[PDB]
């Protein structure tokens, strides 16, 4: 894949592990290591995506200009959606950390069930937006 796709792939691999919510995951969630790592992986994905779009603009098919503008704005919106989705994942995990830190030594099982359900929905959104972004990038040059 492209550099940005490999960066997103590392985000996916790390998130899949987090979604197991094992005791190893819990340790890294409560220390903030998980959200620092997701921030790093998100930032790298977005940096590579912006650089990729910039290089694609060196190999464009000429089109009506109105069309090129439309497609460029649609692509920028798709990039922004991806970044917002990754940040929503990270923010939901920050929320979980704060809730666990407020509850002394009480059982986190219900919190974990609710987190797992929510993360599944956030992953669905990130995945549909990533696939949409790849579709737009694939037809961007031909216009």
Residue numbers in the entry: 23 to 165
Sentences from the paper on this structure:
Human ApoE is a 299-residue protein component of lipoprotein particles and a key regulator of Aβ aggregation and clearance. Compared to the least frequent isoform ApoE2 (C112/C158), the most common isoform ApoE3 differs by a single mutation (C112/R158), whereas the AD-associated ApoE4 contains two mutations (R112/R158).
Despite the crystallization of full-length ApoE4, we could only obtain ApoE4 NTD structures (residues ~ 22–165), but with well-defined loops conformation. Two NTDs (chains A and B) formed a T-shaped or V-shaped molecular building dimeric unit that stacked with another adjacent dimeric unit, resulting in an elongating crystallographic fibril. While the angle between chains A and B in the T-shaped dimeric unit was ~ 100°, the corresponding angle in the V-shaped dimeric unit was significantly smaller ~ 75°. On the other hand, 5 of the 7 ApoE4 structures have V-shaped packing, indicating an ApoE4 preference for this packing pattern. The C112R substitution in ApoE4 led to the formation of a new salt bridge between R112 and E109 and the repositioning of R61. The “domino-like” effect of the C112R mutation was further exacerbated through the H3 helix up towards Q123, which directly influenced a tilt between chains A and B. The side-chain of Q123 was oriented upwards in the T-shaped packing, while it was rotated downwards in the V-shaped packing. The upward orientation of Q123 in chain B was stabilized by interactions with W39 and T42 of chain A. In contrast, the absence of this interaction in ApoE4 structures resulted in a tilt (~ 30°) between chains A and B and the subsequent formation of a geometrically distinct V-shaped dimeric unit.
